[PDB]
């Protein structure tokens, strides 16, 4: 096969969540990573994109991100579909949305627009702020704005960050539309989105229809949903299905698996699934006896959260090397378990077989864009899982030290930004074999939210990701490594 990694992930997803194929996960062909002619790698919407500079003077990443948001929205002829984590978009993120909507209206288009946020009077206020800023362009727009929480007890709400236009173009990734953390700051958060076009943008629209179908059903339950619309417009549960072609047009030759999760409180199980997993013998992940652990000890949760299995399968598909860039691998316990046991087992299995693993996380000095005190909380866990498969602790340490790079993130030679604040990173990135990668909103640390992302198999694109993000990251981050097989570092 030309696509061994997607083939493996797809086989796992059809066993885990067959009933959700099409809507919460979907494999498509014929996509394109949507870069410019001048800089074909700039489908990779990293921010701030100021490598080497502790003052972050020339934010080529941020500039491209905002321009691409505006460009995509400005090309809308039918629909604009946005999801994010509250607060609602502000600053130049909001400016980009308003500019794009005005541009589409001026080209003569009438648009349907949905903006959904997850949260713990705000929607009506955002709607009114937006309508005011649109001026006469607002007459051409049917707007739905909503904030939602799907489970209070399981801390579940939307965490996806998606911008889909006409079901044809999609931007998604880790970037929340928060000006103070990303933009108006001399210590900007480092993160990444991707831009694509093609059938996979349709997959995102079907995912958002899934969320809005739940949201509209629960729109009168104040504890769950706060909803606001323009004029006398109703809630639009199936805007994508109703407005865009079921199969989006092809734009390229890139194969993609879209995958998300429904968290807790939308759907309890995929009734079509006959998935029956081997539970790992925990470990020390559940800090307290009373916590219900959806990550490690809830088969039904897996079936409505295919993204967890997809990311573990992506790791399992690697033949040579795996790079992981995250805010964290571990969560704060309580209320979440500290780590995903199956994920750490999958990483251990790969290191035991000589596949190299790089993990870069956000500096614990951020703890907050960090949930650990020390990198030892990651290496100790990996070592302990390795011990189960290498015969003991000494052999585990040897395997780990021979095959691991573990570090905290920097983007320049300085240990912190020039303003004295630590670097914060927020990527949700996994790449394998310079071939296949995930960019999306799903953190690898335990989390029970609605999330979404893309797994792309394209060595060309993967090589661009290496040159533009992963290689510069390791250039500056390697100085903090506690383990680095390539330099014989083993602490």
Q: Report residue 401: phi and psi, to 5°.
A: -65, -25
From the candidates 191, 270, 298, 302, give the one annotated as an active-site residue: 191
Buried b (16+ CB within 10 A) or exposed e, 47-58: bbbbbebbebee
Rounded Cα gap, residues 387 and 382, in angstroms: 9
Instruction: Give which of 288, 222, 277, 296 is closest to 445, Cα–Cα.
Output: 296
Q: In the complex, which residue's CB is closest to ligand PO3?
A: 85
DSSP 3-state of 406 = strand
Q: How many helices (H) and strands (E) does the chain have?
A: 14, 18
Distances 263 to 160, 161, 268 between C-alpha atoms, Å: 11, 15, 9
Complete DSSP assignment for 96-112: HHHHHHHHHHHTT--EE
From the candidates 5, 187, 426, 427, give the one annotated as an active-site residue: 426
Nearer to ligand PO3, 332 or 482 (CB): 332
Q: Report residue 203: phi and psi, to 5°.
A: -60, -40
Instruction: Give which of 29, 32, 48 is closest to 473, Cα–Cα.
Output: 48
CB of 444 vs ligand PO3, minimal distance in Å: 10
Nearer to ligand PO3, 199 or 453 (CB): 453
CB of 176 vs ligand PO3, minimal distance in Å: 5
The interface mask with ligand PO3, positions 399-438, x = CB under 6 A, is ----------------------------------------
Nearer to ligand PO3, 176 or 480 (CB): 176
Annotated active-site residue 426? The verdict is: yes
Nearer to ligand PO3, 387 or 424 (CB): 424
Q: Whose structure tokens read 């619309």?
A: 229
Is beta strand 191-197 parallel, antiparallel or unpaired with respect to 44-47?
A: antiparallel
Structure token pair of residue 468? 């533009």
The interface mask with ligand PO3, positions 19-58, x = CB under 6 A, is ----------------------------------------
CB of 134 vs ligand PO3, minimal distance in Å: 27
Nearer to ligand PO3, 150 or 168 (CB): 150
Interface with ligand PO3, residue 371, by CB under 6 A: no
Instruction: Give which of 190, 220, 177, 152 is closest to 90, Cα–Cα.
Output: 177
Interface with ligand PO3, residue 443, by CB under 6 A: yes
Nearer to ligand PO3, 248 or 443 (CB): 443
Rounded Cα gap, residues 170 and 260, in angstroms: 14
Interaction with ligand PO3 in 239-258: which residues (CB under 6 A)? none
Annotated active-site residue 159? The verdict is: yes
Q: Find out whether 19 and 271 touch, Cβ atoms under 8 Å.
A: yes
CB of 443 vs ligand PO3, minimal distance in Å: 5
CB of 405 vs ligand PO3, minimal distance in Å: 23
CB of 274 vs ligand PO3, minimal distance in Å: 32
Instruction: Give which of 372, 47, 118 is closest to 359, Cα–Cα.
Output: 372
CB of 3 vs ligand PO3, minimal distance in Å: 28
E strand segments, 340-391: 356-361
Structure token pair of residue 257? 């698996």
Annotated active-site residue 242? The verdict is: no
Q: Site for ligand PO3 (CB under 6 A): how many residues? A: 4
Instruction: Choose, by CB under 6 A, the member of 176, 244, 362, 458 that binds ligand PO3.
Output: 176
Rounded Cα gap, residues 430 and 453, in angstroms: 11
Q: Whose structure tokens read 């919460």?
A: 24
Nearer to ligand PO3, 47 or 390 (CB): 47
From the candidates 5, 23, 159, 340, give the one annotated as an active-site residue: 159
State the sign of the Cα–Cα–Cα–Cα dihedral 233, 237, 239, 245: negative
Interaction with ligand PO3 in 446-465: which residues (CB under 6 A)? none
Interface with ligand PO3, residue 159, by CB under 6 A: yes
Interface with ligand PO3, residue 79, by CB under 6 A: no
Instruction: Choose, by CB under 6 A, the member of 9, 13, 56, 85 that binds ligand PO3.
Output: 85
Q: Find out whether 198 and 122 touch, Cβ atoms under 8 Å.
A: no
Q: Find out whether 262 and 24 touch, Cβ atoms under 8 Å.
A: yes
Interface with ligand PO3, residue 326, by CB under 6 A: no
CB of 210 vs ligand PO3, minimal distance in Å: 19
Nearer to ligand PO3, 228 or 424 (CB): 424
Q: Which residues make up the interface to ligand PO3 (CB under 6 A)?
A: 85, 159, 176, 443
Residues classed as catalytic? 159, 191, 426, 451
């Amino acid at each position: 096969s030309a696509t061994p990694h997607l083939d493996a992930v797809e086989q796992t997803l059809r066993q885990v969540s067959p009933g959700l194929e099409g809507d919460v996960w979907e494999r498509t062909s014929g996509n394109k990573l949507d870069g410019s002619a001048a800089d074909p790698s700039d489908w990779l919407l990293q921010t701030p994109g100021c490598w080497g500079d502790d003052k972050c003077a020339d934010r080529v990443g941020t500039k491209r991100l905002l321009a691409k948001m505006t460009e995509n929205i400005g090309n809308a002829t039918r629909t604009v579909d946005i999801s994010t984590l509250a607060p609602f978009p502000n600053g130049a993120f909001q400016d980009a949305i308003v500019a794009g909507l005005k541009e589409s209206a001026a080209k003569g288009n009438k648009l349907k627009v949905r903006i959904l946020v997850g949260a713990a009077v705000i929607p009506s206020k955002y709607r009114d702020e937006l309508t005011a800023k649109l001026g006469k362009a607002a007459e051409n727009i049917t707007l739905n704005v909503a904030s939602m929480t799907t489970s209070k007890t399981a801390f579940s709400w939307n965490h996806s960050k998606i911008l889909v236009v006409d079901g044809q173009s999609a931007l998604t990734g880790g970037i929340n539309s928060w000006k103070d953390d990303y933009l108006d700051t001399t210590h900007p958060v480092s993160d990444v989105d991707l831009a694509l076009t093609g059938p996979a943008a349709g997959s995102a629209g079907r995912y958002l229809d899934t969320l809005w179908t739940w949201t509209c059903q629960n729109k009168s339950n104040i504890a769950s949903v706060w909803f606001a619309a323009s004029g006398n417009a109703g809630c639009m549960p199936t805007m994508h299905k109703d407005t865009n072609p079921k199969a989006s047009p092809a734009t390229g030759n890139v194969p993609v698996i879209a995958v998300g999760g429904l968290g807790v409180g939308i759907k309890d199980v995929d009734p079509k699934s006959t998935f029956r997993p081997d539970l790992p013998t925990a470990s020390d992940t559940k800090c307290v006896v009373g916590l219900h652990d959806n990550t490690n000890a809830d088969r039904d949760y897996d079936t409505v959260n295919p993204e967890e299995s997809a990311l573990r399968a992506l790791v399992a598909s690697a033949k040579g090397h795996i790079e992981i860039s995250q805010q964290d691998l571990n969560a704060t316990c309580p209320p979440l378990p500290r780590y995903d046991i199956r994920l750490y087992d999958a990483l251990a299995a790969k290191m035991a077989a000589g596949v190299k693993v790089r993990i870069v996380v956000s500096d614990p000095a951020n703890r907050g864009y960090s949930q650990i005190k020390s990198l030892s909380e990651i290496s100790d866990t990996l070592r302990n899982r390795l011990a189960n498969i290498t015969g003991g602790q000494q052999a585990a340490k040897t395997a780990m030290c021979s095959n691991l790079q573990l570090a905290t993130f920097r983007s320049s030679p300085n240990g912190k930004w020039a303003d004295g604040h630590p670097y914060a990173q927020h990527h949700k990135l996994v790449s394998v074999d310079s071939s296949t990668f995930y960019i999306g909103s799903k953190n690898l640390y335990p989390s029970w939210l609605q999330d979404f992302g893309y797994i792309v198999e394209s060595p060309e694109a993967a090589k661009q990701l290496d040159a533009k993000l992963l290689d510069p990251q390791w250039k500056y981050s390697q100085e903090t490594a506690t383990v680095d097989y390539a330099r014989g570092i083993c602490n």
